[PDB]
Amino acid sequence: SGAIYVGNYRVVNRHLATHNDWANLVWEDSSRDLLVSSTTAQGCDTIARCDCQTGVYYCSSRRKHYPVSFSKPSLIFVEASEYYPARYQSHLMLAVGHSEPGDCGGILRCQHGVVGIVSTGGNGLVGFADVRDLLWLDEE
Ligand SMILES: COc1ccccc1[C@@H](O)CN1C[C@@H](C(N)=O)CC1=O
């Protein structure tokens, strides 16, 4: 589990969204595994606006932050899980690292701010849903 809290927005994995998220929906995209809902309180996270390929992510199944090298956002084939069939997921970045299903939501960050959230995993790989192209998270 986990979310990004920027401005009056809450960014979560679409497959982990709650009823309150769906009832206060701003935007959702199944192909990216992302959903954004509105919040009453202002958040403290800042979004990175860069092309970094190195950063640090939080792994809840280890209680640890790991430094990682990650690929550029791309269209990657992801195996079937309990939330999606086997399919292509867009705007996804891969790294070598530990991930279990419940690690979804952990933040990946670089020197500029938040880069994305854990979205996929298995066999020593971890995939992150990028949010750096979502410029509207910084306003309105
Ligand atoms: C953190 O991901 C894992 C870690 C270890 C093993 C398996 C997984 C993934 O199958 C977990 N996922 C990925 C999500 C997606 N975006 O397709 C849906 C889902 O249930």
Ligand SMILES: [Zn+2]
């Ligand atoms: Zn950066």
